[PDB]
């Protein structure tokens, strides 16, 4: 399987610099053009960089040219995007991508993406509060910056009955919630834990769900 794993995304100030990585495997990396594409918070997709097999030719849209530099390391099979003179309009999810030697310029493989947030606000870890009264439970994830967080319920074994509410920004900080629905014989007879990870603050917070 072709794999593309982005890393290095996160929080950076206007005018600042951040460098993204993309670890590629499952194909001979040095036989392919590589690309970065970003998706804005308005969900628009835009191509932001193209690089050669050998890294000798690079192409960019006018909006990033002079600011972003695509490079690659064919030994380690990493692709990079040095971003500089960052503006708030560069806030986006950044995907590395691989095409096809068949031409036609399709994006045949995408990474999962790394979020870049351009902002003067501080990194803040979340406060996690259980939401306790089929029975529905939740965890409120309050007062964090930047995105994203992930909430898992009993290590993913309850994922099918989960809802993940989009984060809202309020007083410079995000707040979101996650719900899970389980049989009334499953809780409170068994323990239900929400596990909240915020990579930007290297935090993982666990809360047990217990009746109020």
């Amino acid at each position: 399987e072709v794999q593309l794993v982005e890393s290095g995304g996160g929080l950076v100030k206007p005018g600042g610099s951040l460098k993204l990585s993309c670890a590629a495997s499952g194909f001979t990396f040095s036989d392919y053009y590589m690309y970065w594409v970003r998706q804005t918070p308005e969900k628009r997709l835009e191509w932001v960089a193209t690089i050669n097999d050998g890294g000798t030719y690079t192409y960019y849209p006018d909006s990033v040219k002079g600011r972003f530099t695509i490079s690659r390391d064919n030994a380690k099979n990493n692709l990079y995007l040095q971003m500089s003179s960052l503006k708030s309009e560069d806030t986006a999810m950044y995907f590395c991508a691989r095409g096809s030697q068949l031409g036609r310029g399709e994006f045949a493989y995408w990474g999962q993406g790394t979020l870049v947030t351009v902002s003067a606000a501080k990194t803040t870890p979340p406060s996690v509060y259980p939401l306790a009264p089929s029975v529905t439970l939740g965890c409120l994830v309050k007062g964090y910056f930047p995105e994203s967080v992930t909430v898992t319920w009993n290590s993913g074994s309850l994922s099918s009955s989960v809802h993940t509410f989009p984060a809202l920004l309020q007083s410079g900080l995000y707040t979101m919630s996650s719900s899970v629905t389980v049989p009334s014989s499953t809780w409170p007879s068994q323990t239900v834990t929400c596990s909240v990870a915020h990579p930007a603050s290297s935090t993982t917070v666990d809360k047990k769900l217990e009746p109020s």
Binding site: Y129, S134, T136, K142, H163, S212
Partner: peptide, 25 residues
């Protein structure tokens, strides 16, 4: 909707906060 209302946790009230949450699932 399956509707669920939740009182603020003890932790939150101690920290001076009272987020009251309702799901419409």
């Amino acid at each position: 909707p399956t509707v669920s209302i939740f009182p603020p946790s003890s932790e939150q009230l101690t920290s001076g906060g009272a987020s009251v949450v309702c799901f419409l699932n």
